[PDB]
């Protein structure tokens, strides 16, 4: 399925349950962006500059605040580091949020349509063609923004070292 995802995002579900062989395959996909086959039958190497979307569950099934974030994550720390952005989503009980969620789900079940009426969703076709246009586009950066990014990097490095203490 990775080949079909070449030059495109990969939608992987149950990421933690994946076997170690596929873990090594995705590791090769990320670090090298290449797919290599070494078999007697055939030997073909196909380039794979494909992004990955991963969904996983904690080690215990649910996140444990007592344990450190690394402990809750079964995957190797190197794989987590290689990920550009990691989003942690949790379900915290609350009267207001639960009530709104229940109302939304009930309305969806009854009327078979989006309950929200404050705003009208944009047409999917427009969104996808806009995304294609943006992909076709090429930006550029200056030296001042480079210096700003350098300053942000040193600040973030100091903050992250202090946090990792």
């Amino acid at each position: 399925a990775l080949v079909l995802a070449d030059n495109g995002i990969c939608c992987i579900d149950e990421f933690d349950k994946m076997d170690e062989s596929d873990r090594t395959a995705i590791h090769e996909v990320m670090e090298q962006q290449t797919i290599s086959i070494s078999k007697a039958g055939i030997n073909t190497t196909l380039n794979a500059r494909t992004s990955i979307l991963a969904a996983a569950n904690p080690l215990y099934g649910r996140y444990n605040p007592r344990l450190s974030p690394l402990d809750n994550i079964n995957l190797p720390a190197a794989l987590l580091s290689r990920f550009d952005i990691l989003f942690l989503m949790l379900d915290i009980p609350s009267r207001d949020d639960d009530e709104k969620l229940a109302e939304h789900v009930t309305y969806v079940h009854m009327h078979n349509k989006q309950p929200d009426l404050d705003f009208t969703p944009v047409e999917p076709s427009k969104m996808r063609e806009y995304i294609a246009y943006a992909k076709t586009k090429r930006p550029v950066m200056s030296e001042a923004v480079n210096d700003y990014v350098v300053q942000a990097y040193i600040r973030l490095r100091q903050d992250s070292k202090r946090e990792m203490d």
Partner: protein
Amino acid sequence: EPLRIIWGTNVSIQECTTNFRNFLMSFKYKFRKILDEREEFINNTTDEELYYIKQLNEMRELGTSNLNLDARNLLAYKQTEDLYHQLLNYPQEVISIMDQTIKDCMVSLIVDNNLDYDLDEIETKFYKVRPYNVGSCKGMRELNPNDIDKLINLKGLVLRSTPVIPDMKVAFFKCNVCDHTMAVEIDRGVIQEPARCERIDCNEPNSMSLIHNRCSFADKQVIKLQETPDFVPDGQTPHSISLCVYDELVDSCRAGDRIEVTGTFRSIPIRANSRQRVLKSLYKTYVDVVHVKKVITDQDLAKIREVAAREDLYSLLARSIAPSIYELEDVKKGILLQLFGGTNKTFTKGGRYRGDINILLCGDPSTSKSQILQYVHKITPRGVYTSGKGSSAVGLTAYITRDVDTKQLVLESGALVLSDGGVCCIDEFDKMSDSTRSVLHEVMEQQTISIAKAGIITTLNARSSILASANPIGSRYNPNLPVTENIDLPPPLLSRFDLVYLVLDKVDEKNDRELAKHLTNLYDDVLPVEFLTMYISYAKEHIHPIITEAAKTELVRAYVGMRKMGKRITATTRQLESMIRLAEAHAKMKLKNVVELEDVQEAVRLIRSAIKDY
């Protein structure tokens, strides 16, 4: 008079022969230049001189027979535009005519020039023509029946090539009654066996036997070709086409090589079964290839010597090795010394002393360590890239497998064996099988791999250096604990590396700022990679340094001093062999045949810095 015509057309063979002879006899590249709208690039010597006459003369001088023809040159000449169109439409007959005409002109050159070259040798040769550049290249998916028996161009990647297949040319028959022999030619693969003995006196019918080993054969090979990645419209499985190559073109392209092939699109019936003349409706398509293309000198030695004479050669090589890596001078120097390597000693009475150098790259994951391995691979003339516990890689040890293609037992050599005489880079040393660790220990101890499985008892040479990388157990390397605990490797295996480098990403404002500046700018001369590889190859092939008395004294004094530092043992005898190897490698780098005090001083310093980390 008998008038010879190509079947199904109205083209006279005599006209084609005379046109091709005239084209070959008189043709200049200036015609091609004017045709290509490059008339203003015309010079006065090469473009005004006969081209194919010179080609034929050079071919006679070198003794070769095959001639490469550019089809566009036919269009560049007024007479042969019809010949070019015919070649595009009727390739087989035109090619045969071209071959015969080439032989005719080759003999006529000697006849007219009354040269001293032997004619009998020429008369007994076979000549061929290999046209190329016959138009835009089509795709494997655009080949319709209309293109059958026509000349096509196809670009793709080679996937496999069968062994050489003997193809019959002339059949040799023997009489069972009179011991009389006769050779009968083969047409369309049909042997024209005589009905009876050709001898008047011996007219014995039906007594002719075919002697298989006394017949004339040719070379044939079948190759599978896959369309290039850009030809795939959506991303489905790329299609493939079968190619056939005969004679010189055999073994002209290995697996995994991207090639461009010119040939004839042919269709052949397939028999339903082996018992009968019955044929399948559907025909199989393939390409009869006629041309295949793949897509140290005195001056080089002078340049190498000039570079060696440069004072700042060490720094220049260190910079050229890793231009994109910032502030790792010591690691780059160690890598350079490993690449050049030490002197291999073949001792009588002593055995074998290895001249290789092993370096371990361990430290924090943030720092650049895999890029260094990739650079080393790009530089080393011989080597393989591998990661421990990696299915994609071929493997680190030799193994016995089954050839799926052929259903045959084959002994396949591992990555370490294939790296004999080079540098083997192992990306992920931390995670590795026990078996693989034992194989690595054996390779780094005995330098040979032994396998006694599948009824095979053999030993394979593995005289290769190792440049491995490692990561700590946790998210970072803890300075408080010793290196052995952090790297998570056996003390024995960790004590065999000559140089151990601990590149640590300590949080320092200055270092972080400089690294950020370097990285953002990525968005002292440097040597090209090719020249560096050539220099390394020449140094490893020719120069062999030898230790001198001053080097002996310096080495002894340095070892004694290092031992006296520490009861704690600061250094062992291994730290002396490592110094000897490093000094020999440094002497190799300067293209010196004698190890001097400077090399020993450099060696003690590189060895000491790693020990200080330890």
